[PDB]
Amino acid sequence: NFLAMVDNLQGDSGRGYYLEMLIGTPPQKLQILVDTGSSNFAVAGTPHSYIDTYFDTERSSTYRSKGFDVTVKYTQGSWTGFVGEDLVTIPKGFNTSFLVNIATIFESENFFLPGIKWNGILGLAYATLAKPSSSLETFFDSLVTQANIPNVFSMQMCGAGGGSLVLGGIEPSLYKGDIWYTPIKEEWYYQIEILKLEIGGQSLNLDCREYNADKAIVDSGTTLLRLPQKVFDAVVEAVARASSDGFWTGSQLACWTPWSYFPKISIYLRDENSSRSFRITILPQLYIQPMCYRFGISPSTNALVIGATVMEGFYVIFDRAQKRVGFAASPCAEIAGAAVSEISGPFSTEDVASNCVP
Amino acid sequence: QVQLQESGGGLVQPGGSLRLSCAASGFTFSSAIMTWVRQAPGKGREWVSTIGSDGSITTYADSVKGRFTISRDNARNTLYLQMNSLKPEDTAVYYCTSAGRRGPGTQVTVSS
Ligand SMILES: [Cl-]
């Protein structure tokens, strides 16, 4: 029931987007962060600050423990949880319960943060990234298999200035214009090939390999647009020249009373036909974020992450079955009756290498 | 390498019965949720039954409830599907599946 899945997300890019899920027998209601950048389903399993409730396994008659635990480290944060299996229902979209793996967190650090409204995480990336190993069936693999849905999901985030997670399909009401598809280069993260970044129509002076150092990924669980340091510095220099040192490093807010003074930022992606590319473009409203304002781009060590900053401009189709990611401008991506994103193409890729991925 | 290998299909009569097996290697089978899915000619994929790693939780599609029995022998790394009161519309390839992977399948043909 894809229509019942519209508006099933609450929250925003800073505190993440989250889905209501019902777990165990009788069901316990939890609020679960949608993370296309990881592959484990995990919930709080004990009281903690910054959460109101947790999943108590002793109260579910269908819970079964797998008899082991797992630690998951991210760059910022980590958790250790017992691994078990239980029945889950997603009230908005499905008529039935499904058996899934579930990790219940008994220790964490810098994972549950102040201001968050979620108490668990739904990892929608591929088997490759599941811990302790790829044999721990992912939530979406369980769902596709047990709910008879196509191997596709899609996401509209509406909180620039909730949203929708469509499990099994694409909802036409959630985008305007055409959908453009870029190939998934490797099935772990949603890794896609970036060919070029432009700032106000000016291309940066960088080999396309730099944008894929060592991967460009689409990740709903990352707040900002994160760029490898060398790309970040080039971006910052272009955005500054076309317009507070602490502001670029996010260590400071910037205040007025603003947007007309800043350039559009374009990311070129290779089309499914390799001789063509398209571009997704964010306007200043997406990256000069009202909070006074914060800079919505930050440095990364080894990944270009198309986080919520950019996804809030787009309907994003994670088409696993056809190994491609789709993008279309989002109707909800407007601020004060003005679109804050664009998509266009085709452009020729004749002057770019046939593979920008190292 | 993870391997799954179904067997035991073939031709049966309406009202007949079969035991399917799925042999698993290359992963810790006794820790895996295991699923049977089938694909009938001219139809999309249809989930049949799921069984939790320890065998105690089993779920079934309404179309097979009360006719089919899923089970597993963890010590032999074997998943089973025992099917009673077979119907022509049970004609399908049956696959065992775990963690995105599936075996080559086994064909059940139910013919009048
Ligand atoms: Cl599993």
End-to-end Cα separation, chain A, in angstroms: 40
* Structure token digits, residue B46: 């249809």
Domain regions of chain A by residue span: 17-149, 150-358
Among the partner-chain residues B37, B57, B97, the one whose CB lies closest to the CB of A99 is B57
Sole residue written with tokens 């070129």: A268
- Ligand 1 centre to CA of A104 (Å) is 15
Give the ranges where A215-292 is alpha helix by DSSP (H).
Answer: 229-241, 245-248, 284-287
Q: How far is the C-alpha of A97 from the C-alpha of A157, rounded, in Å?
A: 26
Residue A97 CB partners (closer than 8 Å, separation 6+): A87, A88, A89, B59
Residue A157 CB partners (closer than 8 Å, separation 6+): A9, A13, A17, A163, A220, A308, A311, A312, A330
Beta carbons of A210 and A230 less than 8 angstroms apart: yes
* Structure token digits, residue B69: 């029995």
Is the Cβ of B54 closer than 8 Å to some Cβ of chain A?
yes
CA distance A290 to chain B (A): 42
Catalytic residues of A: 35, 219
DSSP string, A47-81: --TT-S----GGG-TT-EEEEEEEEEE-SS-EEEE
Beta-bridged to residue A134, according to DSSP, are: none
- The nearest alpha carbon in chain B to A149 belongs to B45
CA B95 to chain centre: 6
| CB atoms B47 and A145 under 8 Å | yes
* Structure token digits, residue A121: 């995480």
Q: How far is the C-alpha of A341 from the C-alpha of A343, rounded, in Å?
A: 7
Q: H or E stretch including A9?
A: strand A9-12
Beta carbons of A226 and A298 less than 8 angstroms apart: yes
Would you report the helix, strand and coil content of chain B in percent, each value rounded to 5?
Answer: 10, 50, 40
Q: How far is the C-alpha of B92 from the C-alpha of A108, rounded, in Å?
A: 47
Size of interface A-B (CB pairs under 8 A): 61
Q: How far is the C-alpha of A149 from the C-alpha of A154, rounded, in Å?
A: 13
Distances (CA, A) of A2 to A138, A150, A164, A224: 21, 11, 10, 28
Among the partner-chain residues A62, A85, A146, the one whose CB lies closest to the CB of B47 is A146
Q: What is the CATH number of domain A17-149?
A: 2.40.70.10
Strands A297-300 and A225-228: parallel
Q: Nearest 5 degrees, angle CA A162-CA A167-CA A170?
A: 85
CA distance A100 to chain B (A): 8
End-to-end Cα separation, chain B, in angstroms: 40
| CB atoms A146 and B59 under 8 Å | yes
Length of chain A: 358
| CB atoms A145 and B44 under 8 Å | no
The SS3 call for residue B88 is helix
Among the partner-chain residues B35, B52, B54, the one whose CB lies closest to the CB of A146 is B35
Please report residues of B whose CB lies closer than 8 A to that of A68: 31
Strands B34-39 and B18-25: unpaired
- Ligand 1 centre to CA of A23 (Å) is 17
Provide the CATH topology of domain A150-358. Cathepsin D, subunit A; domain 1 (2.40.70)
Burial B11-33 (b: 16+ CB within 10 A, else e): ebeeebebebbbbbeebebbbbb
Enumerate domains of chain B plus CATH numbers.
1-112 (2.60.40.10)
Q: Count CB atoms within 10 A of the CB of residue A194.
A: 23
